Amino acid sequence: MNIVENEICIRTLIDDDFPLMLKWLTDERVLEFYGGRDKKYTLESLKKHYTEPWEDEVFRVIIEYNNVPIGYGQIYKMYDELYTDYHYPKTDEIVYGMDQFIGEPNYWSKGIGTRYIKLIFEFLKKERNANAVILDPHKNNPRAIRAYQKSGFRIIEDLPEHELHEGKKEDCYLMEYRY
Ligand SMILES: CC(C)(COP(=O)(O)OP(=O)(O)OC[C@H]1O[C@@H](n2cnc3c(N)ncnc32)[C@H](O)[C@@H]1OP(=O)(O)O)[C@@H](O)C(=O)NCCC(=O)NCCS(=O)O
Ligand SMILES: NC[C@H]1O[C@H](O[C@H]2[C@H](O)[C@@H](O[C@H]3O[C@H](CO)[C@@H](O)[C@H](N)[C@H]3O)[C@H](N)C[C@@H]2N)[C@H](O)[C@@H](O)[C@@H]1O
Secondary structure, eight states: OEEEETTEEEEEOOGGGHHHHHHHTTOHHHHTTTTOTTOOOOHHHHHHHTTOOOSSOEEEEEEEETTEEEEEEEEEEOOHHHHHHHTOOOOSSOEEEEEEEESOGGGSSSSHHHHHHHHHHHHHHHHHOOOEEEEOOBTTOHHHHHHHHHHTOEEEEEEEEEEEETTEEEEEEEEEEOO
């Protein structure tokens, strides 16, 4: 995948990206909201994690802003494990999920995440005929939730004790965008 829209480039993750990703995912500012501050990656263990295979389609991408890599996304075709855990019914609809972080905190709350999401929405519509996109943020991450609401996602389910984060199972929302 490769998308360019003025300041933003979204492109496929390659092995050369992992040292900078290690910087992001050893940064306690970033880890508070993605992964958890108790994660202890090395370059090798991070690469192992981010090269684990997926049952169905996945896009792993790097987000660049003004020619500097600043974050990471993964965009994945929905699969049975997640349909089940989300209590989100499998239908004839084409559904994707997406996880992402901006690893440069100076680029938070400047609208870049919302620009990124909308570019992915457009890609999935034209390239995959997607009908819905879903994700599952922590209830106590309002910056993410508000970005997702700006982008068109709506809360559709409560997911109690959904995700272990820093030793505690955090309540989440299931949020859905339907074009
Ligand atoms: C979640 C992001 C990708 C969102 O992208 P970002 O570019 O920051 O979002 P945005 O388009 O600026 O929208 C954020 C909105 O929330 C607002 N906001 C910031 N902090 C807030 C808070 N504590 N409470 C409520 N709103 C807040 C912010 O001002 C902005 O609103 P606007 O000023 O545009 O009206 C990014 O903040 C990020 O990477 N954060 C750290 C990692 C992370 O949380 N990843 C997602 C995990 S979640 O499980 O999906
Ligand atoms: N709300 C978004 C959340 O996104 C991540 O968590 C997600 C993991 O990334 C997924 O893991 C997949 O991606 C890994 C990296 O490619 C692979 O190793 C692994 N085999 C894959 O299944 C897992 N399935 C769901 C989990 N919620 C963050 O850590 C978490 O903080 C944040 O809240």
